[PDB]
Structure 1
């Protein structure tokens, strides 16, 4: 029951699944909702690449940290592979 925040440019996808599951379908759940070729994806958690057959529970994050308010954000990238390029959220207008 780990909660994710997949990021790729301005596009951001929220994701929740169990930890004991490979990141293969994690590359494919975005593939189904982006209508793009599947093999071009390359997930980048904390600016590093990880095995497609490896589970996301072993990818670095746990459920006790990735609660929905602050989910374990990850960066997505597509083959041109190519480095992760995400857009950070804009700062709110600060109080005077």
Structure 2
């Protein structure tokens, strides 16, 4: 079963899908192909929890019925700058304005 994800770091967001049965490490390989940083320089999170490399996405709570095409699940990403890892930081999206009177 496919799960639909937004992988997020700072002001970067990647839309991709993967299998419920695929591993955290396999998702780092996907990120590597896109942003050119190897798996050992990556940490992936679900909310504030660091995800272990050998776990499947399903085990980590990304399931086909919560990680949907029209409302994908967010995975946090942090990079290692040289020696140590930056902290997880996701810039929020902009805020919608007030509804006009007629709405």
Structure-1-length-normalised TM-score: 0.90
Gaps of 5+ in 1: none
Moved more, 69-78 or 31-40: 31-40
Moved more, 31-40 or 7-16: 31-40
Whose strand proportion is higher, 1 or 2? Answer: 2
Whose helix proportion is higher, 1 or 2? Answer: 2
Instruction: Report the Cα distance in structure 1 between the residues aligned to 2:53 and 2:14, rounded to whole angstroms.
Output: 19
Structure with greater Cα Rg = 2
How many aligned positions are there? 96
Instruction: Report the Cα distance in structure 2 between the residues aligned to 1:95 and 1:14, rounded to whole angstroms.
Output: 28
Work out which structure has the larger RCO, using CA pairs closer than 8 Å and 6 or more positions apart in sequence: 1
| RMSD of aligned Cα (Å) | 1.3
Q: 1:74 to 1:95 in 2, by over 3 A?
A: same
Moved over 4 A (4+): none
Instruction: Report the Cα distance in structure 2 between the residues aligned to 1:3 and 1:10, rounded to whole angstroms.
Output: 19
Gaps of 5+ in 2: none
